Design a protein around this ligand. Structure first.
Ligand SMILES: O=C(O)c1ccnc(C(=O)O)c1
Ligand SMILES: [Mn+2]
Length: 546
């Protein structure tokens, strides 16, 4: 109990240091946080690092929100037992000093956090290697009160910014609506600690992907609200902001009656002619249709390869590749321009999309409230019109042309056609009654979605004819290679609340899934190492049985 203070940098016991740090935390941005360099006795932390590397077996784990080499999953033999640190005596001592009354008095003082539990120790040890990442979250769980991360990269080398693995903090547009882009990034060194009071609606942060073949070790922890009576402690002494909305617009009665009439291969020569403008002959034949029909009957899903015909395939591949190679992709939401929008908020998703609605760029609360007071509906031809006029002005250079947006919008218009929906009804024996179409681009090192269920149309819940499912299509147009292992991310994942579909990005594929209430779906974060964005067209429909 005497040697505890001496196991820290002596500056933290200095009144001048403490008061200075308290003020720095008070006045920090974008929410209250701070950092201390050279926190712990150097020999102790060096010994901890050596113990960890020697004694702990790390296991890669990937979910929608992270990829990390973990040690924490118990019931798996490699799982770290915090009740048995027999062989990690230095780690045992590190935990002891961090949760000591002496340190908690200091730390609670400078963070203005109030009392902190000494008995509720809560730490975990993780390494990040190339491709590892942890996407946006606020740490708000149970009795967590202060978050800290102590960093243990190689003590004899500087960790460089371009290595990645930075701790990024996100400012607040309004409570529970973090800005899509971070406003600060800490590049951590050995024996540096970062920390922040856990703040519902505000303490949003992530860990930037590690971009090089290095290992970075960290020890993440929390201080908790004390146990009742612990050291005297006495207890007590949003959908609206998501864009795009998971909402569909109902179809005209003309369309719905068309589909019913057909279901109660009744496609005309003229309709096949229209469908063959975009779709491969293989999938318009009597046999191809029969195969797809049976596959959907047996699986309630379809995974079609070479969906579009060669003409539209060649066109789209050219213009997408050209845009990838010769134009500057925006990498901040402020830089995104019509016809594109940024999906928000970043603790739910981040990607670029074209929805056909009037342009929005959400930098301020006022920008959001303006959109919510003035809801508008998609119109893809007007979006085309607007592009053409921006395009003519600048000139349509190799570096500014909208060739890819125009082709993609044309493709969206095809899927918006009454005849395509007739084809869809033919394949599925379902009658679409609503639609939402989005063109999406997932940039390397930025974009992703997280695991969510479909959103039923509330107004239609009482309708017996309408199936309790959402039909969802994905037309992938990703022309780059290297995705097959899933290691570059970008894979489309459908799973039950076991995996139904795990499809890395590929060129010219069409996935179709009839989702019941409990099916989860996401597109995994695209690695910085990916050779292009993931490009796709997303389609959703409410359906009734005929
Ligand atoms: O392990 C980390 O470095 C880390 C950083 C930020 N957040 C977490 C977390 O688990 O909340 C962990
Ligand atoms: Mn965290």
């Amino acid at each position: 109990e005497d040697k505890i203070k001496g196991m820290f940098n002596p500056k933290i016991w200095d009144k001048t240091f403490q008061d200075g740090l308290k003020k720095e935390i008070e006045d920090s941005q974008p929410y209250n946080w701070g950092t201390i360099h050279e926190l712990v006795n150097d020999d102790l932390l060096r010994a901890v690092r050596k113990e960890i590397e020697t004694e702990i077996h790390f296991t890669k784990k990937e979910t929608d929100i992270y990829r990390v080499n973990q040690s924490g999953d118990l019931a798996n033999l490699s799982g770290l037992d915090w009740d048995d640190l027999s062989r990690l005596p230095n780690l045992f001592k590190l935990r002891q000093i961090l949760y000591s009354k002496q340190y908690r008095d200091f730390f609670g003082y400078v963070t203005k956090a109030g009392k902190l539990s000494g008995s509720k120790t809560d730490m975990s040890i993780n390494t990040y290697t190339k491709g590892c990442h942890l996407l946006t979250h606020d740490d708000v769980i149970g009795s967590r009160r202060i978050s800290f991360i102590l960093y243990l990269p190689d003590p004899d080398r500087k960790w460089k910014s371009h290595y990645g693995g930075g701790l990024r903090l996100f400012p607040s547009i309004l409570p529970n609506v973090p800005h899509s882009d971070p406003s600060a990034k800490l590049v951590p060194q050995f024996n540096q600690i970062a920390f922040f009071k856990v703040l519902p609606g505000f303490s949003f942060h992530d860990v930037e992907e590690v971009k090089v073949d290095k290992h970075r070790l960290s020890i993440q922890g929390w201080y908790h609200i004390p146990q009742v009576g612990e050291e005297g402690y006495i207890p007590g002494e949003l959908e609206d902001f998501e864009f795009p909305k998971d909402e569909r617009n109902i179809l005209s009665f003309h369309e719905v009656k068309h589909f019913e009439k057909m279901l109660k291969v009744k496609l005309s020569e003229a309709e096949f002619t229209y469908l063959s403008q975009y779709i491969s002959p293989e999938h318009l034949s009597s046999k191809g249709i029969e195969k797809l029909q049976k596959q959907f009957v047996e699986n309630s899903s379809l995974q079609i390869e070479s969906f579009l015909n060669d003409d539209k395939s060649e066109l789209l591949k050219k213009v997408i590749k050209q845009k990838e190679l010769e134009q500057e992709c925006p990498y901040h939401s402020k830089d995104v321009k019509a016809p594109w929008k940024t999906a928000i908020p970043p603790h739910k998703a981040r990607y670029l999309y074209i929805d056909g609605k009037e342009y929005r760029n959400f930098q301020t609360e006022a920008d959001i409230l303006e959109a919510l007071n003035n809801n508008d509906l998609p119109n893809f031809q007007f979006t085309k019109d607007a592009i053409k006029i921006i395009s003519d002005a600048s000139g349509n250079s190799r570096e500014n042309n909208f060739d890819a947006e125009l082709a993609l919008i044309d493709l969206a218009v095809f899927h918006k056609s009454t005849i395509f929906k007739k084809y869809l009804a033919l394949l599925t024996s379902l009658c679409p009654v609503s639609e939402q179409i989005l063109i999406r681009r997932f940039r390397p090192g930025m974009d992703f979605t997280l695991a969510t269920k479909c959103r039923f149309n509330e107004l239609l819940k009482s309708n017996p004819d309408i199936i309790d499912a959402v039909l969802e299509g994905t037309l992938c147009l990703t022309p780059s290679a290297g995705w097959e292992s899933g290691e570059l991310g970008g894979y489309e994942l459908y799973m039950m609340d076991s995996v139904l579909i795990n499809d890395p990005p590929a060129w010219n594929t069409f996935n179709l899934v009839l989702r019941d209430e409990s099916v989860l779906e996401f597109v995994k974060y695209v690695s910085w190492s990916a050779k292009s964005s993931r490009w796709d067209v997303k389609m959703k429909w409410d359906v009734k049985s005929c």
